[PDB]
Amino acid sequence: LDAVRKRPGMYIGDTDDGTGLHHMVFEVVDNAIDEALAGHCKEIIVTIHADNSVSVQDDGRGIPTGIHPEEGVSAAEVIMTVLHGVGVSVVNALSQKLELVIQREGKIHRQIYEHGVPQAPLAVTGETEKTGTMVRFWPSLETFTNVTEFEYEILAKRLRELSFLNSGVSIRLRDKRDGKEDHFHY
Numbered sequence: 001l002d003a004v005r006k007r008p009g010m011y012i013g014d015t016d017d018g019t020g021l022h023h024m025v026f027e028v029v030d031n032a033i034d035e036a037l038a039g040h041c042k043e044i045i046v047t048i049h050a051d052n053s054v055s056v057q058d059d060g061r062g063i064p065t066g067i068h069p070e071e072g073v074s075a076a077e078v079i080m081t082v083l084h085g086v087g088v089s090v091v092n093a094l095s096q097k098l099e100l101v102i103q104r105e106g107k108i109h110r111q112i113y114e115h116g117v118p119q120a121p122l123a124v125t126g127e128t129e130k131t132g133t134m135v136r137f138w139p140s141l142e143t144f145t146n147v148t149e150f151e152y153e154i155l156a157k158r159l160r161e162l163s164f165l166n167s168g169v170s171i172r173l174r175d176k177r178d179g180k181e182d183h184f185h186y
């Protein structure tokens with residue numbers, strides 16, 4: 001991920017005018033839509049938190065958790081830490097913190113990253129009947145300058161377009177700063 005950290009603008013877009021900052025959410029959403037499409041209920045929820053982090057969750061099958069034969073760490077970590085649509089690894093590299101939760105095969109798995117560095121291996125923390133994935137990320141304020149807060153309408157505009165293109169996927173957008181909400185479903 002050092003190639004991304006070296007020139008963040010080349011991977012994510014402009015890091016001063018808000019375009020890169022918002023692209024961070026859109027990259028996570030693309031992965032979440034792919035996941036939601038492979039499950040039954042097909043809903044994602046995008047939440048803007050009061051501390052200007054964003055979470056994206058889906059009710060799909062869960063990102064795979066098994067150890068990658070060649071890389072020797074969880075498949076979940078491989079995807080977060082290997083350059084491969086730019087990849088969620090870019091978002092991870094440019095987040096001062098990123099938290100994930102995978103619910104799969106009866107188990108809750110958790111992991112925390114800081115600036116793309118895993119703090120510990122993916123770990124089973126509990127049991128569950130549910131399936132799905134959730135990522136919450138705190139954009140790096142070392143990278144993102146001037147525009148550092150999420151504009152609701154920029155997110156809402158793109159999620160609307162996505163709802164028409166991915167017919168039958170339910171997309172919820174919530175802003176915990178002021179209570180605003182939308183539900184895009186074609």
Ligand SMILES: Oc1ccc(Sc2ccc(O)cc2)cc1
Binds near residue numbers: 075135
């Ligand atoms: O609802 C979502 C939100 C983000 C993602 S991306 C991803 C998640 C975990 C992970 O270990 C690797 C990639 C997928 C589905």
Ligand SMILES: Nc1nc2ccccc2[nH]1
Binds near residue numbers: 142
């Ligand atoms: N503050 C800060 N910025 C970082 C960038 C890369 C790796 C670790 C880091 N800690």
